[PDB]
Symmetry: D2
Subunit: 66 residues, 4 copies
């Protein structure tokens, strides 16, 4: 909540999923991903795109009560 290694994965995903095969490959290595201790079978599809969408709304909502 939320550490270095992870925002990596969250993104490494984004690349795999969005079809950025190369960028996936390269970032996979540069990120030292296969040493990165997260469980990938236990994090959602399009996990990056979403968590973002919401942080925006969290902003949007902080504007409007104020």
């Amino acid at each position: 909540s939320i550490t270095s290694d992870e925002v990596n994965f969250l993104v490494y995903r984004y690349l795999q999923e969005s079809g950025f095969s190369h960028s996936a490959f390269t970032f996979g290595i540069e990120s030292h991903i296969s040493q990165s201790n997260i469980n990938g079978t236990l994090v959602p599809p399009a996990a990056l795109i979403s968590i973002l969408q919401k942080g925006l709304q969290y902003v949007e909502a902080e504007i409007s009560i104020n």
Copy 2:
């Protein structure tokens, strides 16, 4: 709110800033990033990182209010 191009640019930026130039380079070309209708001076640093943090916050904030 919140198109591919944007989440892309956010990421590209996270790569540079954090020092993943080898990926930064590859991703930029694969995600046609020179054709970006984004003002990069109008992209604060740690942008991806901090937005992402507000997502998670908004998630906790919904779970604990239930």
Copy 3:
């Protein structure tokens, strides 16, 4: 006899042919390969590999004459 581009193209091919598809892609862009005055429809397969072989013989036979 023998330009930068020339060797470059020779390599680019080697990457595609040998199926080093990630690098091929990357090297393509780094070595500004699309701007080249090479006819690719004229570049025989196993281009580099076999040119190497002949070089290596030219070493060996310039040693065995003396």
Copy 4:
């Protein structure tokens, strides 16, 4: 005389030397270079560029004795 792995390292070199840093890296991985049985410090600078130059001269020498 002349193995798959051999021509790889040779090129991997050329990439570094040539200041093709990004393609050196990706190809470092894609060609499983850390597993390859060459002593890196037992191959001279501009190794690829030259073995090539000679292979072409050998070709020339063959045409001109006929």
